[PDB]
Amino acid sequence: AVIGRLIKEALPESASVSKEARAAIARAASVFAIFVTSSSTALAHKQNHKTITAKDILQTLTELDFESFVPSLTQDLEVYRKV
């Protein structure tokens, strides 16, 4: 899919990914979204909010050990809100 480029974008020059590796990465990314959604719900639930917010997901991300993610997503939200 578009996962093919995202992958070969994250990998060094001339690297290759077998069709099983990509498939696996695809399933992995799918469980990730469901998992982060699920967890954001819980955090949004413990944080009182009736609705999941941009900060409920960014907090879940970091609470789920993917704090690296946050800085860009915040840089993106900031640019996303202006447009």
Next chain:
Amino acid sequence: TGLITNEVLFLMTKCTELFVRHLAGAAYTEEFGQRPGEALKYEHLSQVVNKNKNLEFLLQIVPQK
């Protein structure tokens, strides 16, 4: 449960693709470090998923064959 905002559809899409890059990269880096031009296989993905603790939710999705 409330509704799902665009800002969220957006943020969710944005971080999933960061995770695709993360899992791929992490899997390669843990196998071939920085060495370029290597071939990534399923073993490498199930290897980091069995290593990195922040990836334990994927133990059943990316098991070790």
